[model samples]
Target: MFKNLIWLKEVDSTQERLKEWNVSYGTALVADRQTKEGGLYFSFLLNPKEFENLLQLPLVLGLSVSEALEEITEIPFSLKWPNDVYFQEKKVSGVLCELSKDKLIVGIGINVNQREIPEEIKDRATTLYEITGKDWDRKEVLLKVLKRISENLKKFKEKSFKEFKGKIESKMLYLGEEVKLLGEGKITGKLVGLSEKGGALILTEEGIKEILSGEFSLR
Candidate 1:
């Protein structure tokens, strides 16, 4: 995976470039800095066949990143549903996925070496340097992340949904905590787990509710 890497000194967004470039599978694009306000932005193109559980790809990729970072730094990381990576309750990375034609485009933004965070989000955002108090080689970190993502994608293809769901649930940020889902109205419940079909399983007063998409926060 990421056998072919394209690097740019600066770019508007790797996600945008991936779509514009129409890169091939196993190809990755990285930018030293995103012109817009964001973290390290990069994208990967992969064959659609590699993503059997399409809905769970984000979760799988999030876990892969957490595992990779843990292996490198020996520090534990947790994933906020469905694909936000957090360290010590602060966001360190995020993952987004898009499908085009016959391929999957996975985009990720990880705060690696950035030292300054805007005041508005400084309290809730963090970087590798902030968390570890050390500078990191972005290329080195990207390679490890891609390696883990590739391995996890292979596992997703080989494993059943039930098995993969269990793996994702184990790394969830608030597996059994009562949380608030912000939608039309505020709904609070215990996050029992995730649905096998897809989405989150919240044990509410009304019973188990499966939320496919929405903004949720820990109470």
Candidate 2:
């Protein structure tokens, strides 16, 4: 419901900038500059009404973007638990959420339009340019994302998350494939799927078990 997007040429963090301004419930803050301090590349500010009502906003937003891109490309982006966006096995975007007295700021950053990644993340990170072998218009990409978010937000306001759960699960990467149970160390099991709430994944070895994000990791 952003009436206008305020773009900052540079900022320590879009999230911080929004917080400093005490952005209104539907305001969005965007920045295009790099910060030495690692922080979310973008952010949104919302009032408590929106924050408390939509607990699944971040995941839903990721799903909306993933679905929109599916119409034009076959890059295969998927949601990783709470709010990470992944393309194949690498992270392509991340979502961070924060709340204030009357609002929630849902910051989303996708590695779109960036031609190169930091050397340390080269092997594990990707962008629209890398996947398509061509550069994408930055403004166009953001517009597409905003459109998808609007469409999904309408559905979210009218329906239960159960309707989208199946679609999200269908995109899960390691279903039926063996994966490491992170903290469990040596424990390994076939990746099952997710529960209704979208927090825990189901894994099975001798029997079925629920594995929270804490213990789940892709191999």
Candidate 3:
């Protein structure tokens, strides 16, 4: 999956480091300790133009992490639309994709081994160690996710939305739950599923509404 991986003891931001280095395609930057985010931080360098469904890249990575964790832990993991992974209604991971004219830097943070979450997000977030009561080897977890990401990216390129729409929807974090979409217009409804183009499908009083892309959350 990774063309060449660089492991750093610490970094302020893997995304920025990838940007500054402009590493080759499929190159991955991994940090044992990121000065900022609490979790395992990994960044991959990809060509922005290689993908047709580039807009769905974030969620694709989310699904990769979700699937990887589930396979490893045998615990159910769900994906929050676009960029977050959840376990037992608590956030377990997040994806951040930064785009430039020539590059796509995907930064993924999995709450792998944090012993404690911050006070502000303590109740809302969780880690693998916190979940299992034992420490995990971050490298193994990262590679598992990387392998899934590689396969899914190929699946996306070959099959477009059809390859993943239903699979991703099946693992939606807030499926059938009341939620609010806060972009363009505010709409509150049940998050039913996803549209063909990855738009969040919300069942409102106005019937099923497909939110193309927006900030969505539980109501």
Compose the digit string of candidate 3's lDDT tens values, residues 96-155: 888766777888888887876889897889998888887878888988899999999887
Candidate 3: list runs displaced more than 4 Å: 182-185
Which 10 residues in a row give candidate 3 its minimum summed lDDT? 46-55
Name the lDDT of candidate 1. 0.81
Misplaced by over 4 Å in model 2 are: 36-40, 47-55, 72-74, 100-102, 186-188
Query: Which candidate model has the greater lDDT, 1 or 3?
Result: 3
Error of 3 at 111 (Å): 1.0
Compose the digit string of candidate 1's lDDT tens values, residues 33-52.
Answer: 88762246689886777665
lDDT of each: 0.81, 0.67, 0.82
Candidates in order: C-alpha RMSD to true structure: 2.0, 3.2, 1.9
Pairs that clash in candidate 1: none
Q: How does candidate 3 fare on TM-score?
A: 0.92
Better of 2 and 3 by lDDT: 3
Strongest candidate by lDDT: 3
